[PDB]
Amino acid sequence: DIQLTQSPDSLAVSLGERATINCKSSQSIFRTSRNKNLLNWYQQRPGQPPRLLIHWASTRKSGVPDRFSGSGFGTDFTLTITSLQAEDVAIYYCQQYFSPPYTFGQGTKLEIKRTVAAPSVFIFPPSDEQLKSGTASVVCLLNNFYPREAKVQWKVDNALQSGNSQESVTEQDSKDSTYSLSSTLTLSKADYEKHKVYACEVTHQGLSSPVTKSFNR
């Protein structure tokens, strides 16, 4: 079948700048009749269905901003996004519409480079309803920060925790280009009642020195 290779796999470009994404096909996708290269470009925004941007290698779909443009011939194709906006955060896919299977490239993840944003840190104690069940989940929230790089440390009575926490990060926001993160500390009702001070310590580029949020059991 036809193989589509995108480059790079991931890309970070600053707001208002230009993004260049390559798509190489293993063979010609030029249909002599109609005089067209049968290449498509799609945008798949966080938690959304894919959107057609370009068909016939350079024909932009109506309603698609002129900031998006496709180019190339033969086997070498390019998607260009000028004046990068926050809502351009997505994974970009090229697709061959020449012969079945109508194969897609592996996608190119587009990260929006934005100004440094410090996280807002919030701590949540386990609920009384959960404690009854026999488990304690302690949640630490890092809200609306940039860049992604963040160190989150749990301290139970100043004793550095390890192997008992899980993290989840949201996709970059389409308006403010930030990330949000949750760190969940899981303990048994017994191991939880053994201690008093529950603290979450956050290290991020935006904060002058590591921030700490805590509660007493």
Binding site: D1, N40, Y42, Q44, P49, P50, R51, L52, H55, W56, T59, K61, I91, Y93, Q95, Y97, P100, P101, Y102, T103, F104, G105, Q106, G107, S120, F122, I123, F124, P125, P126, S127, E129, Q130, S133, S137, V139, L141, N143, Q166, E167, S168, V169, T170, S180, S182, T184, T186, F215
Partner: protein, 212 residues
């Protein structure tokens, strides 16, 4: 309008069969090629199948040929995907799309989970704001299987500042997620905050009030 809606996805035993439907509206369905595309969560788009205007020509990805059957009922404005001998590599969101230049008007997609693990409903716990100008609160949706779970706030009346975290697979093999919202601290005295959790695979619908 133009609308494409996929349904029929759910939890199925490996070796099992499932039938997906794609309901088309707002256009002359019978004049267009129809495609099925799948997406393994966190992975890329994989073209699965297509059929021409009347279903005289069909094609399939190598990974599904022999197990899947694409069909269309033009009179009923529906595309179908019959899936047989399902395996773990078939676990994906399945999308349908209409043709011409490329694939357009993709639907929301339907999740197909191929697993022998049991259906399990979640437990919903509040992430209450503390007394110690903006306040954060949320709901912890814990120990469920399979995906997905949907969370809304105040029956959809609260959308601004909401972050529903991707679900994480725990050491147990059960999923868990938290949904959070930052609100003005000034509203904490009068404004009620309720997270609306729905886990359709287990018939679990939970409304949980989060109070400070």
């Amino acid at each position: 309008e133009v609308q494409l809606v996929e349904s029929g996805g759910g939890l199925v035993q490996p070796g099992g069969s499932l039938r997906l439907s794609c309901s088309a509206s707002g256009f002359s369905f019978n004049s267009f090629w129809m495609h099925w595309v799948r997406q393994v969560p966190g992975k890329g788009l994989v073209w699965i199948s297509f059929t021409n205007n009347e279903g005289t020509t069909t094609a399939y990805a190598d990974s599904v040929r022999g197990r899947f059957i694409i069909s269309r009922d033009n009179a009923k404005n529906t595309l179908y995907l019959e899936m047989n001998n399902l395996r773990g590599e078939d676990t994906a969101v399945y999308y349908c799309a209409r043709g011409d230049g490329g694939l357009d008007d993709w639907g929301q997609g339907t999740l197909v989970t191929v697993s022998s693990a049991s259906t399990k409903g979640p437990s919903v716990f509040p992430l209450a704001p503390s007394s110690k100008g903006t306040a954060a609160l949320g709901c912890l949706v814990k120990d469920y299987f399979p995906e997905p779970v949907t969370v809304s706030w105040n029956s959809g009346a609260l959308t601004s500042g909401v972050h529903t975290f991707p679900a994480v697979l725990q050491s147990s093999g059960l999923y868990s997620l938290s949904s959070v919202v930052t609100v003005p601290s000034s509203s904490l005295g009068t404004q009620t905050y309720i997270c609306n959790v729905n886990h359709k695979p287990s018939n679990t619908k939970v409304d949980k009030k989060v109070e400070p």
